[PDB]
Amino acid sequence: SHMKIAILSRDGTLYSCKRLREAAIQRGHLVEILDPLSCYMNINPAASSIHYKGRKLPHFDAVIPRIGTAITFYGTAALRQFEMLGSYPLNESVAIARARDKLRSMQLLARQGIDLPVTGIAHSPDDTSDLIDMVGGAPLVVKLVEGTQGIGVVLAETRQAAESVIDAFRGLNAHILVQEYIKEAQGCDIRCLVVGDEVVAAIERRAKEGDFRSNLHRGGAASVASITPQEREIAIKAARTMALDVAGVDILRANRGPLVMEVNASPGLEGIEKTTGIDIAGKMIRWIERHATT
Amino acid sequence: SHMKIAILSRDGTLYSCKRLREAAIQRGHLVEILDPLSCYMNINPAASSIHYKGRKLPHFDAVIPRIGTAITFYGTAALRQFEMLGSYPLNESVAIARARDKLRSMQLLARQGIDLPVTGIAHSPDDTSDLIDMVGGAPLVVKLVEGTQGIGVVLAETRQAAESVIDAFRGLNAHILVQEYIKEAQGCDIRCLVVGDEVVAAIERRAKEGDFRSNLHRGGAASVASITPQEREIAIKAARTMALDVAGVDILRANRGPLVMEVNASPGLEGIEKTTGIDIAGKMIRWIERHATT
Amino acid sequence: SHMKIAILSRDGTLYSCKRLREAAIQRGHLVEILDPLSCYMNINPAASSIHYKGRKLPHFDAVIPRIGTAITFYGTAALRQFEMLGSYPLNESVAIARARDKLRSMQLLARQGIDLPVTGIAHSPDDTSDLIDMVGGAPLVVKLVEGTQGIGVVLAETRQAAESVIDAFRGLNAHILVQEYIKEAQGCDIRCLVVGDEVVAAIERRAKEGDFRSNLHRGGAASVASITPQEREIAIKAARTMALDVAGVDILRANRGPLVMEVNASPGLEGIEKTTGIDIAGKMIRWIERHATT
Amino acid sequence: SHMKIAILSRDGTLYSCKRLREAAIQRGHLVEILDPLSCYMNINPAASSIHYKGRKLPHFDAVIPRIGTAITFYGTAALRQFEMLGSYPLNESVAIARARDKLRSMQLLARQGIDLPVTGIAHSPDDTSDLIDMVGGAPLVVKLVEGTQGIGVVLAETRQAAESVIDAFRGLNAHILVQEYIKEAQGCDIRCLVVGDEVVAAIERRAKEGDFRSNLHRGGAASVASITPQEREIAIKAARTMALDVAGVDILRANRGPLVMEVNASPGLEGIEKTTGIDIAGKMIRWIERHATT
């Protein structure tokens, strides 16, 4: 087999290490870890070599992009050139790009029939009351975003809280913002990791006592999870819908049923690997092996 | 005929006025001018009405997006919902979005065989000298960008100037940056306006005495233009390649031949209309008439 | 008399016009309106001439700074050099600088015994409940700030609203934030204009029906005002405390008495002049005449 | 003795550790390390207790501020309240604030007779050529700043390089910018640390081969230094001029003589302590002991 695999990321942390690791072990591939910001290239004379620290990169059979949530325009541009050069990517540029846009993504999932929590979109709404009644929620979650980031979620328990929050962010200096209703659940969401056509690993993220969130560490506490065949199907469908080869789908257990809340094109590996003991980084190299062409 | 056409833009300026104007005249259409930021809607239960100042919008047969270069994530999200609701757009969401990304666009044009000036892409290159020799240029233009904007172009006449400039912007607080070679020309570029499958109008933009630029007004001076059949074909091909129904293509007259430098999905109307005396806003309403379905 | 007065501001709008106007009329002074951003100078060899569009400025007997709320670091640097060159300023650099910092200013006023509304300061408080009980308010105003700007005020009517708002902004991407209690009043505040040791003019700013604010135009409606001798004294004391020669003091009429809410070192002239019919721009030139040394 | 000393900083890193360390050792003081962002307090009813994680802070005899270069408005506001409460600060709020403003500081040093390199100040100069000839330098250093930060320095060796750089940053999206001439020296500057009325420690910072800088690590390499009595006097005078109790003065060895280039109100301790083996953190606690009042 023996591939030259590149890993597009900004440094050596567990996930990037765990595949330098699993690609050198598994069918003895060669691996170079490249900062996308240090690539530079002629986007003109179509294709052309990619340059890195004064030398020309040597042609990778595959590229594993792991692009930051703040470097996504240049990151995917570099990714694109590798694709143009022949490298197989897990998660392709177009799909990664789209994925960062939570709005376009939520829309896409919704159109494709995937059960989400009822969700409003807004920026400078002009009539907060009408916005709150739309969506329905007497208590709901407001999620600030700003461009393509996320900079806060907050629970609004009463009508007035939801009003004061929206009116606050309305001062466009916060820009785009999302409304969806809160849950039964209990600060607990299931995170599935999809690689290709299967859910490779899954954990429960539980919130702390003080309010909810649940986030990785906003007071988070991980534990191994018991996914229903229904939840497994959905998390795969979300990834398929998104055109992601590797993805983190987050699911909320509502009375009505499982609801997708978020999809990630660069899920972290540490918490989910350490929690379950599963070789995820290996299932990704294995996926590359089944699809890249040497 | 009689359509309800919406115009997605942030205010009443010549271009937005000139089509409220041309749609009310031409086959007596009804027009509402909407700020995208004031739309708010359920992106979930697939489709769902768009809300605006407390009321529900009434279904537009067509939407004319004219989205700002700084509102492009929410703008195209709102655009998308109109599309999902049945409205025909001139310039669709996906195509508009992509267009803002100058990097993805330059790449796309290049791949599709369109003659551009030789162009390097870079962010934090690590070896400026190698970057400068790549691209070739002893004198070249450095174009700062930052995310998806543009915040400066500058001519670097010597090797050292090109060095000092790159090293300056390299401090990532400027982020993504473009290198391409300077011209014969003479601070003068041809701007074509494409509507559908034809170039509807064209002007020459001439720079002032002090250095170049040429920009609309960075010292700009407009005058009617004599486009060659070759230049006309290209400006149409660029728009086709970009999937833009309406576009501003800017062309540089180089010795080698015409070179596309830029493509815009919301070209201004004033300078080009006043200069030529052509009813552009009408050719766009006319285009809508040939393609929207009532 | 005949002075050379410079006006440090970024353009010709009512206030800047109304003193080019009043300085050319009143004792026939000469006036140049300079953009601070276009000044450039040697801050070293102590003093040294200030340069502007390739020429050296000619020595102004006085400088009227009218520096933007976003240009205040360079603005006051240029201001400083004029001071170093001999020019008398109304509002000096140090005082202007300090004034932009609403936190340092509120603190200073408070220390100097000036009645303010009870006010909490916070950034990432860690225990919102304790913050809300401090300050007291069951209903209070949260005022987002971010560095030195202001980007929103909002009323929180219930405990929960005040909670959700603080928790929202707590995501430091909003940075520094202010809590103070809401009023009787009724979206109405008195704005005094101080020039030297007297209140030169005063208006009432009344809010619209929908909630409060009251702002110039956040639904604002101006009308001539009846200031009590007590309110007049305070607005003068605030300016004195702040070391401002010209200032806009905003006062809230509370049961307890008049409360300073805000102090401005570049108050607008239009609304207050048109409302009252008073020649404010002239009272400022007159002040310059009494204090600048030719 | 036994003082309660607070350390205002955002975390445990060498310098903050090395004084928790030296204050618990030296005359057995009690130390609490507080994040300024987590303080919250009533700036009104003059003074009032400072709150931290739901509890009231207990009165510190002294406060050691170590405020970030990006938190300086809120940081110094919290600092100010400690001062208002009786705590002795090394480096007081006003002096710290001013210090962040490199422009006001360079100006102040210059006015007070301290030899600096010849330095131009500019933002959007309008005539770069005149700016370059002012300052004199055929080769000079351009230092981007933006508000109050620093985001780049660069050497411009030729006239054209200096032109292209200024014209680049001129696009105000870089904001305020500094010109000063380059050196003999050789990417090497002397860094003195002043505590009170003496230079407590000093190192040489040497640049790498590729161009200059010299920065801590922009390729930096530290080594113990041999300060002349002249250089020692200056570094003390700079700190005195700046009203800093603790300061990092950086000096360039020019033919003409020693030139101050920079003054810091929160110098790092690690590089300078490890290089020289001097107990700096102790000389600061000792200073506090001589001046704080229990």
Ligand SMILES: Nc1ncnc2c1ncn2[C@@H]1O[C@H](COP(=O)(O)OP(=O)(O)O)[C@@H](O)[C@H]1O
């Ligand atoms: N609609 C909702 N209902 C209930 N809890 C939610 C909802 N949205 C988010 N949360 C909680 O808040 C946390 C933050 O959500 P968010 O930032 O959108 O996603 P992520 O967990 O991927 O960062 C989630 O882990 C979840 O437990």
Ligand SMILES: Nc1ncnc2c1ncn2[C@@H]1O[C@H](COP(=O)(O)OP(=O)(O)O)[C@@H](O)[C@H]1O
């Ligand atoms: N590669 C180039 N060679 C010569 N001149 C150029 C080049 N790129 C840009 N210019 C000049 O600088 C101006 C600014 O270009 P740019 O900002 O990229 O496009 P736009 O004109 O669409 O804003 C152009 O009008 C053009 O005349």
Ligand SMILES: Nc1ncnc2c1ncn2[C@@H]1O[C@H](COP(=O)(O)OP(=O)(O)O)[C@@H](O)[C@H]1O
């Ligand atoms: N503590 C308060 N109590 C009642 N109303 C307030 C309070 N603070 C502000 N407001 C109202 O909100 C408006 C916005 O206040 P702010 O932005 O702080 O000052 P400014 O009016 O100078 O912009 C004010 O005009 C005022 O009428």
Ligand SMILES: Nc1ncnc2c1ncn2[C@@H]1O[C@H](COP(=O)(O)OP(=O)(O)O)[C@@H](O)[C@H]1O
């Ligand atoms: N005027 C100058 N002449 C020569 N070298 C300089 C000059 N200014 C700065 N340098 C070099 O560049 C480095 C960066 O300078 P700067 O960022 O201003 O200060 P600091 O070293 O405090 O960060 C300095 O250490 C110095 O060696």
Ligand SMILES: N[C@@H](CCC(=O)O)C(=O)O
């Ligand atoms: N969200 C869109 C798709 C977005 C895209 O294709 O990029 C939809 O409803 O299909």
Ligand SMILES: N[C@@H](CCC(=O)O)C(=O)O
């Ligand atoms: N620039 C890409 C296309 C980008 C896209 O499809 O969005 C190419 O070379 O085809």
Ligand SMILES: N[C@@H](CCC(=O)O)C(=O)O
């Ligand atoms: N706010 C400070 C004064 C601020 C200053 O002097 O700059 C005080 O209580 O005196």
Ligand SMILES: N[C@@H](CCC(=O)O)C(=O)O
């Ligand atoms: N730079 C000023 C002093 C600045 C200040 O006092 O804050 C001077 O020349 O004195």
